[PDB]
Ligand binder design. Structure first.
Ligand SMILES: NC(=O)c1ccc[n+]([C@@H]2O[C@H](COP(=O)([O-])OP(=O)(O)OC[C@H]3O[C@@H](n4cnc5c(N)ncnc54)[C@H](OP(=O)(O)O)[C@@H]3O)[C@@H](O)[C@H]2O)c1
Ligand SMILES: O=C(O)CCc1ccc(-c2cccc([N+](=O)[O-])c2)s1
Length: 315
């Protein structure tokens, strides 16, 4: 099955296309090809600075009569500098304007950490620490709720929230909408067993980001573990006559996760979608889960003293 049921009654495609670090000079073509070969879910964000070019691609394939709006599942995220209640709607509407859409299927709080409002995406003080804002998770959530009630977004969710931060929203007095989704980093080196259990036990769908280990992440170091180059995973891939990337995308699908691999290379965009014709064995799944090392692609040292930094908690 290609889609999973959210708590708002809508169905979310379990395979989507990532767009972080897809350059605007290349992302329009990426999205066009993705839609041609079957993708219906695109993961976006204002901070990725390419939503206009994503929107160009979508508008065109709508104009070519390739897909209908209703068939697409478009996700975007509220950036950290817009957590103030007064700023949330304008942030969403800028995303809608850039994407040339009149609604989003899902809008996420990108990180639990609010940052000082201003033009800079990562405002730092003279010593490198992020400058926080005096915002909290619950008031930001309340502002997200308003986006649903105004018809700008069909579903709201969170990203990079630890289980206590999710619990805060769940237990919120006067809660109007539960989060539909928690989008978190998840791959064989960061398997997230406890947070997935927690989220699934609350009827929150989990989306796995950086499923290939984000080899293009800008702070990569040579010493770092490399999933796509891991000979153990290559050996499971060769057993199935599939690529390592295909095994890494199939793995979260078999854990009832959504997964959003990124590529701007047309060959790979097509490759990565061809994951519905094979199954990883029980042994393969156990093997892959065994590779956990609690290794994160996305954790900025610059935010570790923020009151809402998510990764001090075990999960
Ligand atoms: N919520 C958040 O905080 C958050 C954080 C990180 C990521 N995300 C979302 O998750 C998406 C996926 O994560 P990611 O972008 O970090 O990394 P990823 O999907 O794990 O890895 C992307 C990298 O893998 C390469 N690649 C793709 N398919 C390949 C294949 N078949 N064989 C070999 N290499 C391949 C890509 O290269 P080319 O593109 O050059 O082909 C790119 O360098 C992001 O784009 C974003 O949408 C969300
Ligand atoms: O933006 C993306 O989706 C991928 C790019 C990023 C990587 C780390 C990011 C981050 C932002 C705020 C706070 C923290 N934190 O508390 O660790 C991390 S953003």
């Amino acid at each position: 099955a290609s889609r999973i049921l959210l708590n708002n009654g809508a169905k979310m495609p379990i395979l989507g296309l990532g767009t972080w670090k897809s350059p605007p000079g290349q992302v329009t073509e990426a999205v066009k090809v993705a839609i041609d070969v079957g993708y219906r879910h695109i993961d976006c964000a204002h901070v990725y600075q390419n939503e206009n070019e994503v929107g160009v691609a979508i508008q065109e394939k709508l104009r070519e009569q390739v897909v209908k709006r209703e068939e697409l599942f478009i996700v975007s995220k509220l950036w950290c500098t817009y957590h103030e209640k007064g700023l949330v709607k304008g942030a969403c509407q800028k995303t809608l304007s850039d994407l040339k859409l009149d609604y989003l299927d899902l809008y996420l709080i990108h990180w639990p950490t609010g940052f000082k409002p201003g033009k800079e995406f990562f405002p730092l003080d003279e010593s490198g620490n992020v400058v926080p804002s005096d915002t909290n998770i619950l008031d930001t959530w309340a502002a997200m709720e308003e986006l649903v009630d105004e018809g700008l977004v069909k579903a709201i969710g969170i990203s990079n929230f630890n289980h206590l931060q999710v619990e805060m929203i769940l237990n919120k007095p006067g809660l109007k909408y539960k989060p539909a989704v928690n989008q978190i980093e998840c791959h064989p080196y960061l398997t997230q067993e406890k947070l997935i259990q927690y989220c699934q036990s609350k009827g929150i769908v989990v989306t796995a980001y950086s499923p290939l280990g984000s080899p293009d992440r800008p702070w990569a170091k040579p010493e770092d573990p490399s999933l796509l180059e891991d000979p153990r995973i290559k050996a499971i891939a060769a057993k199935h006559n599939k690529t390592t990337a295909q095994v890494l995308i199939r793995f979260p699908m078999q854990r009832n996760l959504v997964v959003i691999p990124k590529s701007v290379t047309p060959e790979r965009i097509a490759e990565n979608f061809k994951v519905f014709d094979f199954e990883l064995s029980s042994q393969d799944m156990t093997t892959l889960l065994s590779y956990n090392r609690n290794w994160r692609v996305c954790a900025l040292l610059s935010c570790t003293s923020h009151k809402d930094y998510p990764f001090h908690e075990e999960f």
